[PDB]
Amino acid sequence: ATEIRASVGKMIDGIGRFYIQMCTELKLSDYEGRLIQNSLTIERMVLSAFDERRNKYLEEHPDPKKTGGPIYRRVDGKWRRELILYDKEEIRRIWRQANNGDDATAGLTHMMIWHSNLNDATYQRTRALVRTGMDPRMCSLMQGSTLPRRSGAAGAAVKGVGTMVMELIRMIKRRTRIAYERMCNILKGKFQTAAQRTMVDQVRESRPGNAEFEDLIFLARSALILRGSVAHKSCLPACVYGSAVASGYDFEREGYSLVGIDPFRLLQNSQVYSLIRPNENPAHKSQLVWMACHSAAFEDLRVSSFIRGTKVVPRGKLSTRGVQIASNENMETMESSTLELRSRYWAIRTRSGGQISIQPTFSVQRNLPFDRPTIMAARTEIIRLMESARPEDVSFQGRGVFELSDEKATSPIVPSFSYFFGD
C-alpha cells in the first residue's frame, strides 16, 4: 500500500528533521553529524528525555532536568570528546516540532530497534541467559532482548522467541495478569506449528511454577529447529535519515519501507563515519554496522556474504570492538574512517522462520532426491517434529536476491552453497 509506505516515510522524515535541528543546535559539522558516535549520543538524548519511568523517578528523588552523553568534534587536527548537558524539555520540544506537533512514539521505537540490532551484532548475552534459567547457546533466539517490556507494536514484532521466553520466566520467578496474558499471545503468534502454539495456551491459562517454567524452556529449545515468526527491520542510524532529508529526499512523498529495497537504496547513497581504535580494521567495523543495519546478527554468514559481496566473518575472528567509545579511552590515538555499508545485492526481510519425488530411468550412481517434509508430514509431537527436520532441508523455495537496479521483485537470483557467534 502507498498509505503504509507513506506513514512509514512520515516517521523517517521526522527522525531526519529532528537530527538536522539537533545537529545545528550542537553546531556540528556535516561530517561530524555523520559520525555514528554522535548519532548514537543524539539518539540516546531523545530516548532519555522521553524515558517516563526514569523522569518520574528523578522528580521523586531530587540535575534531573538535563540529559547528556559524549559528543565528538575535530579540533586542531585531533578528535576531542566532550560531555554535553542539554535540557530535556527542549529536546522533547525539538522532537515534537520535527514530527509536526506529535509525540510520535513510533519514531522513537524505530531508533530503539536500531540500537537493539546493534547490540545483537556486537554482544553475545550469555550472562543474562544463565541467570534466567536457560541455555547460553539459545542466543539465536534473543533478538530484541535489550529492548524494554512495553516497547510498542513494532518492538513486539522484532523480539525473538527466546526474548519472549526470558521475559515470561522472569515474571513466573517473581493488573499484571493482563500483561502476562498479553505477552503469551505475542509468543503464541510467533510459533508456526499448531503443536507449539497449543503448548503455549496451557502455559497461558494458569494461575505458574516449575511445570510452566519447564514448558517455556522446552518451547524455546524447540524454536532452534521449529523456528518462530520473528520480524526483521532495517533501522538505520538517525544521521543516515538526517542527511537524506538534508540533501533533498522526501520520504513522505517517495514513501519508504523497512523490509523492502528502500534501506539498501538509501545506504548506497549514504556516507557514515566511525571512530577507530589504534589496532582495529575498518572493514570489520563496517561489517558489524552493516549487520546491525539489516538485523543480520543471527543470520547464516553465507547468505549475508552473498548479499554483501565481501566475506562476512564470524564474531570471534573480527578485528574490532564495539562502536561506542568508553570514557576511559584515549582520544589522542582515535582516527575517523568511512563505514562501508553498501551491498552487491538486496533481499526482502522475512517475518517467517508439482513433482515431489523422482523416478529413476537410467542406471547411474547418484542420490534419489525427494522433498521429505511435504511427503512425511501427510510435548510428544514436538520431539516427533524436531527429529524429522534436517539441517539440509531447504526453506524459502524459489526466493532469491535482487540487483540494486531491480526496484520490484522481478528477477530473483538463487545462490548455490555459518554462525556469527560460533565456537
Add this chain to the structure above:
Amino acid sequence: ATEIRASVGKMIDGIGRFYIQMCTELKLSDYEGRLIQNSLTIERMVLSAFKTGGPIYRRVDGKWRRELILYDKEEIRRIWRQANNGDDATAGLTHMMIWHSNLNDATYQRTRALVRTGMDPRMCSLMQGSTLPRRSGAAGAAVKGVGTMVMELIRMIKGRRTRIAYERMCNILKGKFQTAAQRTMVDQVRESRNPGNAEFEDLIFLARSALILRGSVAHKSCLPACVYGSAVASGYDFEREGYSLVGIDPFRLLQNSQVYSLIRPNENPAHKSQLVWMACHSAAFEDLRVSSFIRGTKVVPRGKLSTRGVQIASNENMETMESSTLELRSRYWAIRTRSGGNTNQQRASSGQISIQPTFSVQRNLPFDRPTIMAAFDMRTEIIRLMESARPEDVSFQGRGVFELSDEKATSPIVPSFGSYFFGDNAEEYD
C-alpha cells in the same frame, strides 16, 4: 611544499565557495548539485563569462527535467571574484579548464584534428590538453603533451607578437624533452626565420620520437567543482589542511565524495564510472595495467565501454534518463608524475635476451630478435637513441602504489605484472 599546499588549498576553497553560491542561486538540492551534468554547466558558465547559460537538470515529479537558464556574464564574473576573496583568481579557472581537458582526453579521440595538422592519428598519448586553448595558464602549459605542443606549432606555421608566441611555445616544448638531442632540434626550429615545411617536418619527427623518448608532461587530478563545493559545505577547510593535485589529497577527497550522473537507456553505469575516474586522475593515456591495479577493478579500453559522453545533448529526450552513483573510488593511490620515464643514462643494462640449451629436448630456442639485431646529425642521433630503447625497459625504479591510510607515502607497493585505452577500434586491434 607547505606554501604550495597553501595556495592550491586556496584556489580549491574558492572553487568550492563559488559552487555552493551557484547552487543556492539556482535553488538546487544537494543531490542535484552533485549531479556531474549540473556541475559541468556551472563550470562552463564561469569559463564562458571570462549572457551565458546551459542545461540544468532537476528532479521534478519523479522525472528528470531539462531547463536552459541564462545569466549575465557580469553577474557570474562578480560571483567568482567574490567567492575568491576579492582576487580575479585566474588559477582556479584554468583548474576547471584542465578538468574539462582531462575529461575530453578520456572521452574523445581527436583524429580529424590530427590529420588536418598532418599528424599521425596514432599519436593519442601525446595529445593531453589538446582541447585546451592556445595560451592557457602556466598550469595549462605544464599539462599539455608533446603532440599538443607540436600541433599548436604547426597551426602557427600554417603584428610581430606572432614571433614571441612562436618562441614561447618552442621553449614550452623544449622544456618537456628529456634528451639534449631533442632539445637541440627545437632550438633549430625556433632559431628559424620565416618557419615553413622544414620546421613542420622537424616537428613531426620530434612527435614520433616522443612515443619512445617520452617527454615530461604534468598530470593533475582535477575534479568537477561539485566535489570541491560539497567538501567545503560539509566542513572541510582546504586552506587549513592544504591541498595537492599530485599527492594523496584528491584520492582521499573522492573516497569521501559521492557524485551522480545521468545515464542513457543502453549504458552501463560502471563504464560511465571508469570514464570519469580516468578523467579525474588524468589517466586517459596511462597503461591500463597500472590504472586497473590502482583502481582495484579492471580498466577496460574505450571501444569496449558501453557508454557515450558525459554531457547530454538538447536533442535527446529526458523522459528516458535515469540517474546513477558514479564509482570514483580506488583500491590504492599513487603519486601523479611529471616524468616521461627513462630516456637516457644507459648505465649498463643487466638482463637476459637469449638462452643456452642445457638439455637435449625438442623445442624452439627463444631470443630477443629486435634487441640483438639493433646493434647492427641531431636527427640520426635521435634515431640511434630510440633504436636502443626497448618496450621491456623499466621506469620509475623503486616507486609504487600506496594504501589510502599511508598518508605520508611510507610503504610503496611495487606491482607484479591491454595497455592502450584507444587501442581497441574498428580499424586497429592494439
Add this chain to the structure above:
Amino acid sequence: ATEIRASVGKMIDGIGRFYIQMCTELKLSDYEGRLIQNSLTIERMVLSAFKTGGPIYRRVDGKWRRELILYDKEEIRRIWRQANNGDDATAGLTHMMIWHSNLNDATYQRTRALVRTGMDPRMCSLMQGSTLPRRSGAAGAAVKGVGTMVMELIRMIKGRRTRIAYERMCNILKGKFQTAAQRTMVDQVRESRNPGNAEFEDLIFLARSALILRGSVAHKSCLPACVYGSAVASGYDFEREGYSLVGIDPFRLLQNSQVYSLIRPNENPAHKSQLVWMACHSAAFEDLRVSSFIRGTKVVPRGKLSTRGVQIASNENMETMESSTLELRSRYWAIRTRSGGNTNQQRASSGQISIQPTFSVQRNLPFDRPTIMAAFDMRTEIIRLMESARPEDVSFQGRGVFELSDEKATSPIVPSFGSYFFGDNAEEYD
C-alpha cells in the same frame, strides 16, 4: 543473383542425379553411398573419364570390405551427360575438382613442390588450388591462390600457344592483386620477350608481397557428391530453390546432412571431422580463431590432429577399419569472401601505439616498436607499402557471422578476440 542461383542450382542438381545413378549401379546402401571414401572414388572415376576404377567399400558380414571394380570411361561419360540433361556439363566437373583441391589443401603441405620451383615453403597460405591442374575452369582460376599462380608461371619459365597461355596466366594473377604497384609488376613480367630469371625473381617478390598485401582469391564451399546426391534423393530441388557456394546454402545443407568416414585404429573421429569441415568450406588457410568461432568447437592446427588423410590406401588392411559419423555442422555461418582484405586506401589510422605515464609507479613503458620505427621503382613502392601494414590492422569492417536461422544475413555478429593451421610442425612453432 537469381540467375546465378539458377545455374549453380542446376549443376549441383546434376552432380546429385549422377551420384544417385552411380549408387544404384553399384548396389550400394544409402549409408554406404554416404561414406566419404565411396564418394571420392566415384568422383575420381568421372574426372578420370573426362577403363576407370578405384576402391569401393561395403559392409559385408559385420566387417568393412574393399573391392576395386572397373568401368568403361565411355559408359561413365554417358551417365554424366545424361544426368546433366544432355549437356556436356563441364562446370559440375570442375566443382568436384575444387572440392578435391580444398581437401588436398587441408590434408597435405606441398613443400617439396615449393622448393623445386624455388619458392619459400612458408607460402602455404598462397597455395589454394595448387593440386588443381593448369588450365582448370574459370571457377578453378578464381579459386587459385597467388602462390599457385606464381608456381605455375615459373614452371612455364623453366608452338606459340605457349605464349598465350603464359599471358592468360599473367592476367589471372594480375586480376588478383589489389594494388596498382603489384599489377604494374605483372605487366612487366608479361610484356617480357623470352622470359627467364628476371621474371622468376619478380614472381618470387610478388609472392612474398602477397603475404602482407594479400590478393583476391575466391573461396567456394564445395561438398562431396554424396551430400548433393543424398539431398536430391530426399526431395530437395536445387533448381527450384537455387544454390550458392558463398552464401548460407552449403552451411544449411551440411546441417541437414550426415556423412560417414572410415577411421583407422589410432585416429580421433573428431579430428577427422575438423579436416573435412575445413575442406568443405575452403578453410585450410583461414585464421584458426575465426574457423573455431564459426564452427563452435576449437579448430586445432594440423600437427596436433590425430588423423591421417581421408583416403585409405590399398596397402593397409580392412580388418581393423571402423566407420564413424563426420561432424560437419557449425554454430554460426559466414559469407565466403573473394577479398584478400585491406591493402591500401590508408585513410588516416586512428589508434594508440604508446602510453604516457600518469602515475609514479615502477613498470615497463610499452610501445609498438616496429610501427614507430617504420617511418624511418615499382619494387621499392611495394616494400614501402608492406612496411606500412601492421598485423593489427582490421579488415572486413562491419561484417560478421550469422545464426543459421538468419537466412538473409540481417544481423551480423562481430566476434571479440593459434592462427596458422600449418604452423605447428617439427621444424617451426608458429
